[PDB]
Amino acid sequence: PFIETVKMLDARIQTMDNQADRFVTKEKKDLIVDSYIKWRISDFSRYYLATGGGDISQAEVLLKRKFSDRLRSEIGRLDVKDIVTDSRGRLTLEVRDALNSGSAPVINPNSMAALGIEVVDVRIKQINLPTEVSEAI
């Protein structure tokens, strides 16, 4: 008593959804993408240290910052037809692999493994067009 405190971290998979945002394809075709990510805590101590106080929002912020970068870098090389016709989720799987294992038993500092976060699935919910392009279609 009065010496040891306890902090609780939920090991259940957390779901973080991203609101509508615009991405630029290889032909400057603007797209509006809705996507969600599912993540779990790998090392509870490391996750508690990396995010001040173990707050979920602080980790979600870093996850947003990295996921946006990797997703934009992957979309930049692709056609809008390539994105829509994609059914195996190859780009999403590559984004997940980049998020889990970064670029330089060594752990890259920019990887999510350097934090206490493991990304288990990345999926895209809907791909829309700007209202002008939709009206033209």
């Binding site: 615009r22 630029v24 394809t25 290889k26 400057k28 075709k29 603007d30 870093l62 910052r65 990295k66 946006s68 970068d69 934009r72 870098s73 930049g76 090389r77 970064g102 500092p109 920019n110 350097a114 700007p130 002008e132 392009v133 009206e135 033209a136 279609i137």
Partner: protein
């Protein structure tokens, strides 16, 4: 253009007794490095193809820039967020796409 930079602090004596407000100095250095990197490359490559070399150059430039300061800060990740053109020309981009559709 926007950018996010995530960093850690090591050897706190350097962080405390070297530069006044090391975070502000790092922010200014990051802005300078981003300006320098974007200056060299062209617009379309920045928009679509260079989004990987832009970040790679920016991180190296920031690391080289903050070296003389000898701050305690170590760099984890520099990630490129968005390079959208201004709204006024965004209207023209949308008009060009609509022009393709009208051509069909």
């Amino acid at each position: 253009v926007e950018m996010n930079v995530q960093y850690r602090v090591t050897n706190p004596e350097k962080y405390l007794y070297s530069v006044t407000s090391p975070d502000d100095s790092l922010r200014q250095a990051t802005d300078s490095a981003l300006r320098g990197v974007i200056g060299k490359y062209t617009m379309d490559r920045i928009l679509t193809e260079g989004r990987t070399v832009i970040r790679s150059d920016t991180q190296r430039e920031l690391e080289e820039t903050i070296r003389p300061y000898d701050m305690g800060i170590t760099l984890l990740d520099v990630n490129f967020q968005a390079a959208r053109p201004p709204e006024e020309v965004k209207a023209a981009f949308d008009d060009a796409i609509a022009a393709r559709e009208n051509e069909q």
